[PDB]
């Protein structure tokens, strides 16, 4: 089972699933081999009913699509649509938060409020919204109106792009026409230009893709901004991760999906309901996280993370998961079928994300506390049905220090230099205690033994004194393998990096270092890494493509992740991906993404499937940036 | 060659292409067989990087996607994305017209103006925009602002849906939550909900698709409204069609694509430039149409239609096509390669629609007349290069009466009843001289011998006294085979229908009938058929799903056509499609689209590949509506 997942708790559940005849994601993957080579290389098109069209990667006919579309056009069009779909997911998440803030501040949803008024004011200041003499509710209404305005064309471009990157970067992008005009505007234009008989120039198509990826960045950044206003900016927290955070004697309730508008309410309400749960024979309600909505409530509330991404079915296989509360994105629909075997109550809550066979509760912000209680009462009922059943919770968990928002990282650094908090970080970059910065982002992927790329790459970078930050299921992989436990700094970290983590941690009243990896939050919270990197660039007086900063989507899967990696390249970062998207069928497209995009944005993709080799290439990328700044390496 | 196209001019060019070694769309289609069965049935998914996933239509594993996505989910998600892509094309077209009108009326583009002020005022009245005491330029600015506002969420739903259908229809759709909230909003929500790990309920997914198809209707209707304001509402015109409208001794310039903002300027400017052309040795500039932008300038100016859709390469094969001026949609990118052989100057003009190897001219409304002259001068230069080359223009053309906007049809009927113009039409429906109405819409498709379905179905319906209206390349097919020539009424039309066409034509000072088929315009002008049908429903006091009105997308291809057929079903019409979209791999999805959608909207799809059988099924659908109204049939 270690060929399927490197996580020991997942291996134990895989053994249980096998002997109980419950099919898993890995079984369905095995039933799919050999996968289609046309799809895997990107040489397939179904964008009109003369198709499906395919192109042999090598050999004889077919060489060209029926309408005349070349390999490079078909590949670029497919890639553009996956960026647009990713932008649509991140932007829908942000849009739903914008409506929630608007309703809260108009008195239409009393369960929601301005929890971080400091964040509210700095955002409004960044957007040019005046704050002096204004009520908080009026400022917030202006912020929510500005968020919603960025989805369509207006007299300004998308402000959640132009006000969050350095002016030099914005200018490089405006020069190439890459600034989005409206988030949903760019999504629709991608679908238009990629439909039959429209854009048929690989470079033109890919430039549209870079622009749409910046619409995705804007949705991520807007999502992080609005969630922090509504639910609070994360600060350092201590919790646990992996399946052992389930408790047989408690009502175990997983929050799963991406948007915390739902799950943050669940967290608060479940505390009100401890007495209901005890009445049923539980010790209490044990809310745990799966995927990014789990990351959200982990970052803000210390809710323990149960599992992530590809292994999400195994939380149910324990037999102890009484409810799984879903909003949208990255939910394997198999959970609705597996629930018939495991007893779990799977509950959908969003109108546009239902699963056949799951119970649906029509969540509304106006009725959030009522809905939470209805859902949690179903979880209580499910616990009573299993009172007296054996469960198999693997007794495996790690300690997780997390909550490292960019504001938290600044604050932590400020204990070393109050009025110039970025300087201690840059000092240790310059003197070599910090070789560079690597962000791990994105999903797990059944194609890759779970967590194997994240941990292998992280281990080599940390020994080489790279400061490693992480989001999404990359944070989940690293967290479940001990990389967020400061007790592992001695084992994992090079001497220079250990010295820096120790200095910062000691100055922050901790008695020990910061953890080996800094957890920056959910997938939209990749925007926090952008805020940190832009602040470093501004403090250094250079553009982002001169910083020793790289990204690694080491095991990615989702269209959202494809978009993130694309905007990481567009804002100037060398960006490793550990699973190839369907692009190898066009050498010209591959050359653009790995080489010539350098001349447009200064970033570039690093395609490398072997993780030890990927780590070497990321180190080389970091060290080239170091040399370009005149630094030793 | 008659297995490839029923059009004799196309057959002659196919013979020329074969002996000259120029590959055509039919050759590329032959090089594609056997096409992928997974793609053709819809049982393939590439929406995440764990894919490609496929499902055997029958037999053993794979039975389910890797994430657990069932056949019905995979099929419904693929269909939803094709509706959204179609909506994105029609809405981009309309959006570009909205900007053109705004710039014209703000004094930013002097080449554009309010040409139809009657249309401008009736639209503003329909939208609730006040007109009394307002300058036309201020009313138009309000209309353009309202168009652009329908692309995003606001305090009203999409007005180009709710103000163009009868209130009873709007209410049926609101009850099912099918009213779009914003055009680009719905497109982005489709891409979100269909991405990995989101909506996984076939009925929920398809209800989203019906809503997005109404966003496509709104873009069509808005596109027609704005083009009529800017360029004039069509009125009856006489012209010709097919390749014989090319002239060896003239500069032959094709306008090709969809958006007439470009080609309407070309038409006017080319007249200014007759003397330049004569100086080069041409008789003049001969502008001809291809595809829907050809339909636009045919409807408004009587520009002859050269060819359409699947046969567009054959206009170049004559050797006489000096320029092909492109905007976007339905352009085979092969034209840029074929131009190397034929001498044609292929010119792209839109920023998001370029073709490798074609010349690009950056069209801007602010500089439209200048751009037109630059393009036409390239066409003149190309004519000089072929002075003394042999051309092979097949001497084949038909006479085409067209220009039947809904306003023109009302006006024509008003000569029989001035103050109740719809009544003579309804009279002859009731007494049986008109059995019903059939709209032919959509593309040609290389899978179907060109025009064979359109003409076979039209012939049987016309003998059965159906009033036949047509748009897009369905109008092109019928027009190139004589169905728009009133001289063919005796041969084609049943006695009841002939009597009605003759009565209307005689009352309109024509000496003969209306043509056998009424040309309602381009693809977005399918909205005119909606206006006509809604007006009939309102005059009759019933909803559209009680009218003896059907639609036939007899040979369709493009994602735009998939969307149109879907909203034809959503507004209540039995809707035949003559090529199946990728849906046969899910019987539950097929059952929804062909049967149970009846209970939601009253419309339904008719899947029928055999055209004689399709005609019988359309007649049965028309006759069931007749019976439901208590009429003989
Ligand atoms: S758009 Fe072109 S390549 Fe794609 S399916 Fe249609 S004919 Fe084939
Ligand atoms: S979304 Fe599901 S079915 Fe589609 S490619 Fe990904 S794993 Fe396969
Ligand atoms: S041929 Fe397999 S993905 Fe299309
Ligand atoms: S397997 Fe052929 S279309 Fe995907
Ligand atoms: Fe996840
Ligand atoms: Fe066409």
Curated annotation (Swiss-Prot), chains A, B:
GO BP of this protein: generation of precursor metabolites and energy; response to hydrogen peroxide
Residues that, per the record, bind [4Fe-4S] cluster 2: 45, 48, 53, 67
Transmembrane parts of this sequence: none
Signal peptide: none
GO cellular component: cytoplasm; plasma membrane
Sequence positions that bind [Ni-4Fe-5S] cluster: 258, 292, 330, 443, 473, 523
Major enzyme class: oxidoreductase
SUPFAM superfamilies per UniProt: Prismane protein-like (SSF56821)
UniProt EC number: 1.2.7.4
GO molecular function: 4 iron, 4 sulfur cluster binding; anaerobic carbon-monoxide dehydrogenase activity; hydroxylamine reductase activity; nickel cation binding; peroxidase activity
Main location class: cytoplasm
Membrane topology: Peripheral membrane protein
Cofactor comment text: Binds 3 [4Fe-4S] clusters per homodimer. Binds 2 [Ni-4Fe-5S] clusters per homodimer.
Gene3D superfamilies: 1.20.1270.30, 3.40.50.2030
Compartments it resides in: Cytoplasm; Cell membrane
Entry keywords, A to Z: 4Fe-4S, Cell membrane, Cytoplasm, Iron, Iron-sulfur, Membrane, Metal-binding, Nickel, Oxidoreductase
Cytoplasm among keywords: yes
Reactions catalysed: CO + 2 oxidized [2Fe-2S]-[ferredoxin] + H2O = 2 reduced [2Fe-2S]-[ferredoxin] + CO2 + 2 H(+)
Activity modulation comment: Inactivated by O(2).
Role, per record: CODH oxidizes carbon monoxide coupled, via CooF, to the reduction of a hydrogen cation by a hydrogenase (possibly CooH).
NCBIfam families, A to Z: CO_DH_cata (TIGR01702)
Family affiliation: Belongs to the Ni-containing carbon monoxide dehydrogenase family.
Domain comment (free text): Cluster B is an all-cysteinyl-liganded 4Fe-4S cluster; cluster C is a mixed Ni-Fe-S cluster which is the active site of CO oxidation. Cluster D is also an all-cysteinyl-liganded 4Fe-4S cluster that bridges the two subunits of the CODH dimer.
Stated name of the protein: Carbon monoxide dehydrogenase 2
Species annotation: Carboxydothermus hydrogenoformans (strain ATCC BAA-161 / DSM 6008 / Z-2901)
């Amino acid at each position: 089972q270690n060929l399927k997942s490197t996580d020991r708790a997942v291996q134990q559940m895989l053994d249980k699933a096998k002997r109980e005849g419950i099919q898993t994601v890995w079984d369905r993957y095995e039933a799919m081999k050999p996968q289609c080579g046309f799809g895997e290389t990107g040489l397939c098109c179904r964008h009109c009913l003369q198709g499906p069209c395919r192109i042999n990667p090598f050999g004889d006919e077919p060489k060209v699509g029926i309408c005349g579309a070349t390999a490079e056009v078909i590949v670029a069009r497919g890639l553009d649509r996956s960026i647009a779909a990713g932008a649509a997911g991140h932007s829908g998440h942000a849009k739903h938060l914008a409506h929630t803030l608007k309703k809260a501040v108009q008195g239409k949803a009393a369960s929601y409020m301005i929890k971080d008024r400091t964040k509210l004011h700095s955002i409004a200041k960044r957007l040019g919204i005046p704050t002096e003499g204004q009520k908080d509710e009026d400022i917030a209404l202006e912020v929510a109106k500005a968020a919603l305005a960025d989805f369509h064309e207006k007299d300004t471009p998308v402000l959640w792009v132009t006000t969050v990157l350095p002016p030099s970067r914005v200018k490089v992008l405006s020069a190439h026409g890459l600034i989005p005009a409206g988030i949903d505007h760019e999504i629709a234009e991608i679908m238009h230009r990629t439909s039959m008989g429209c854009d048929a120039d690989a470079q033109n198509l890919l430039l549209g893709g870079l622009r749409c990826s910046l619409a995705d960045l804007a949705g991520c950044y807007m999502g992080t901004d609005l969630a922090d206003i509504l639910f609070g900016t994360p600060a350092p927290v201590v919790t646990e991760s992996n399946l052992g955070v389930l408790k047989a004697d408690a009502v175990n309730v997983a929050v799963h999906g991406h948007n915390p508008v739902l799950s943050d309410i669940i967290v608060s309400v479940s505390k009100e309901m401890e007495n209901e749960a005890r009445a049923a024979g539980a010790t209490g309600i044990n809310v745990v996280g799966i995927c990014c909505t789990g990351n959200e409530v982990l970052m803000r509330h210390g809710i323990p993370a149960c599992t992530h991404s590809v292994s999400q079915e195994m939380a149910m296989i324990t037999g102890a998961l009484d409810a799984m509360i879903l909003d949208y994105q990255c939910i394997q629909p198999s959970v609705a079928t597996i629930a018939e075997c495991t007893g779990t109550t799977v509950i959908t809550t969003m109108e546009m994300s239902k699963i056949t066979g799951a119970t649906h509760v029509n969540f509304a912000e106006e009725a959030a506390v009522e809905n939470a209680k209805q859902i949690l009462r179903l979880a209580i009922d499910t616990f009573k049905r299993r009172k007296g059943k054996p469960v198999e919770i693997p007794n495996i968990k790690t300690k997780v220090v997390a909550g490292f928002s960019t504001e938290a990282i600044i604050n932590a650094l400020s204990k070393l230099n109050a009025n110039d908090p970025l300087k201690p970080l840059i000092d240790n970059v310059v003197n070599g205690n910090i070789r560079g910065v690597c962000l791990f982002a994105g999903c797990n992927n059944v194609k890759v033994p779970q967590d194997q790329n994240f941990t292998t790459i992280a281990r080599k970078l940390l020994k080489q004194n790279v400061l490693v930050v992480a989001t999404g299921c990359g944070a989940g992989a690293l967290m479940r393998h001990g990389f967020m436990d400061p007790a592992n700094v001695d084992e994992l970290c090079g001497d220079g990096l250990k010295a820096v983590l120790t200095a910062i941690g000691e100055a922050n009243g901790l008695g020990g270092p910061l953890p080996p990896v800094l957890h920056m939050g959910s997938c939209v919270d990749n925007s926090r890494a952008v805020a940190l990197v832009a602040a470093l660039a501004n403090r250094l007086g250079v553009d982002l493509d001169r910083l020793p900063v790289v990204a690694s989507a080491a095991e990615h899967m989702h269209e959202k992740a494809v978009a993130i990696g694309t905007w990481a390249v567009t804002i100037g970062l060398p960006t490793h991906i550990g699973v190839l998207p369907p692009i190898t069928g066009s050498l010209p497209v591959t050359q653009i993404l790995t080489s010539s995009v350098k001349d447009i944005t200064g970033g570039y993709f690093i395609h490398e499937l072997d993780p030890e080799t990927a780590a070497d290439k990321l180190l080389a990328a970091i060290n080239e940036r170091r040399a370009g700044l005149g630094l030793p390496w």
